[PDB]
Amino acid sequence: VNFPNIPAEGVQFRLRARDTGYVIYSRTENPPLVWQYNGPPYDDQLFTLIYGTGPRKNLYAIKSVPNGRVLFSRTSASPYVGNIAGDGTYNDNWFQFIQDDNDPNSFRIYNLASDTVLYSRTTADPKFGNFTGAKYDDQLWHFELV
Amino acid sequence: VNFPNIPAEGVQFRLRARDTGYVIYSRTENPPLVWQYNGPPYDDQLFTLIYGTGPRKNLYAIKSVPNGRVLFSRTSASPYVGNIAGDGTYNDNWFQFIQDDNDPNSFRIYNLASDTVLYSRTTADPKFGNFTGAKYDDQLWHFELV
Numbered sequence: 001v002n003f004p005n006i007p008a009e010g011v012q013f014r015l016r017a018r019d020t021g022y023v024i025y026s027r028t029e030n031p032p033l034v035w036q037y038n039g040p041p042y043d044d045q046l047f048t049l050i051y052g053t054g055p056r057k058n059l060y061a062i063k064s065v066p067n068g069r070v071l072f073s074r075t076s077a078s079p080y081v082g083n084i085a086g087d088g089t090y091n092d093n094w095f096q097f098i099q100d101d102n103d104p105n106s107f108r109i110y111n112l113a114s115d116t117v118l119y120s121r122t123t124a125d126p127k128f129g130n131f132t133g134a135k136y137d138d139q140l141w142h143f144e145l146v
Numbered sequence: 147v148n149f150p151n152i153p154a155e156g157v158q159f160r161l162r163a164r165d166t167g168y169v170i171y172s173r174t175e176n177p178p179l180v181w182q183y184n185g186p187p188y189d190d191q192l193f194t195l196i197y198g199t200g201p202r203k204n205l206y207a208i209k210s211v212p213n214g215r216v217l218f219s220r221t222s223a224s225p226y227v228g229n230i231a232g233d234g235t236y237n238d239n240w241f242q243f244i245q246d247d248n249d250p251n252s253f254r255i256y257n258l259a260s261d262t263v264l265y266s267r268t269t270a271d272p273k274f275g276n277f278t279g280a281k282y283d284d285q286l287w288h289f290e291l292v
């Protein structure tokens with residue numbers, strides 16, 4: 001089931017992990033360019049959605065406010081999670097927000113092209129990344145409205 | 147996670163529900179054109195996959211062997227599950243095969259355009275159709291190669 005409270009197209013938000021409390025950031029310099037962060041609110045943590053239509057109905061591009069790059073999540077090559085210019089040129093720019101099975105208020109950030117979800121954890125490196133496999137709570141996110 | 151044993155493109159199979167043991171038929175006359183069935187094997191139970199690429203990577207159109215029509219699954223009008231000619235002209239012709247979280251030998255037939263899964267049950271009417279909501283065992287299917 002698609003998450004029922006997806007931000008209206010163009011509305012700004014942070015993506016905050018339910019369990020760690022960390023937010024995603026997307027910037028253009030200093031690797032890692034997309035990662036999790038546990039600190040003050042900065043503009044590189046702000047995103048909006050481009051709504052997919054046609055073959056991308058129920059998919060969304062995740063665009064960085066300060067730099068205009070959209071997120072990607074791929075299993076092909078490093079960096080596995082990153083950003084790129086455009087409005088969703090590549091199939092791995094398109095995400096589905098899939099509501100959790102037990103927690104109605106959180107969702108997984110799923111990528112159809114790569115069959116992966118994003119996760120945020122405090123344990124093994126890489127502590128932020130994507131993953132193809134079983135459902136874990138560290139895969140659960142909130143939309144934080146600004 | 148995508149089912150790891152999706153039949154090669156052009157390989158013929160039936161779609162059998164795990165628990166009911168019923169198969170999907172797709173015929174060209176007499177509503178319902180697509181429904182569940184038990185009894186001897188007939189040609190209109192036979193399907194192949196059209197493999198999606200680019201935006202449709204990891205999706206598939208389910209094409210009837212004898213009549214060439216592809217399945218569709220929608221929520222906008224009756225019939226909800228049906229067939230249409232072509233090779234996946236419309237977005238609701240495209241399905242994802244999502245492995246069960248518990249049973250790695252079965253999968254759900256998921257429709258991205260409508261956010262539905264196909265189900266086969268002996269209990270309440272309608273006994274076959276599509277569904278948006280919790281994961282139940284009556285939503286699990288097998289590829290039965292012929």
Ligand SMILES: CC(=O)N[C@H]1[C@@H](OC[C@H](N)C(=O)O)O[C@H](CO)[C@H](O)[C@@H]1O[C@@H]1O[C@H](CO)[C@H](O)[C@H](O)[C@H]1O
Nearest residue numbers: 025027031032035036037038039041042043044045
């Ligand atoms: C100051 C600094 O270099 N911080 C980086 C650090 O974060 C570690 C903290 N203990 C934390 O709370 O996470 O490592 C991470 C990668 O895990 C980042 O690179 C941090 O760089 C700060 O990131 C924010 C993101 O909102 C901004 O880009 C800041 O400009 C950047 O310094």
Ligand SMILES: CC(=O)N[C@H]1[C@@H](OC[C@H](N)C(=O)O)O[C@H](CO)[C@H](O)[C@@H]1O[C@@H]1O[C@H](CO)[C@H](O)[C@H](O)[C@H]1O
Nearest residue numbers: 071072073074076078079082083084085090092093
């Ligand atoms: C596009 C390409 O040739 N490959 C990668 C390259 O980017 C080169 C462009 N000319 C450019 O962006 O300047 O390096 C970047 C670094 O982040 C990417 O990995 C490119 O990979 C392409 O990335 C997209 C991201 O959405 C997809 O993974 C594509 O499949 C991949 O080819």
Ligand SMILES: CC(=O)N[C@H]1[C@@H](OC[C@H](N)C(=O)O)O[C@H](CO)[C@H](O)[C@@H]1O[C@@H]1O[C@H](CO)[C@H](O)[C@H](O)[C@H]1O
Nearest residue numbers: 118119121124125126129130131132133136138139
């Ligand atoms: C379980 C394990 O060996 N750890 C990590 C591993 O292996 C996973 C499979 N080989 C796979 O499908 O990739 O490598 C990946 C790197 O992508 C993960 O870090 C695995 O850790 C698992 O990650 C999930 C993320 O949601 C959870 O943190 C699990 O607790 C963790 O075991």
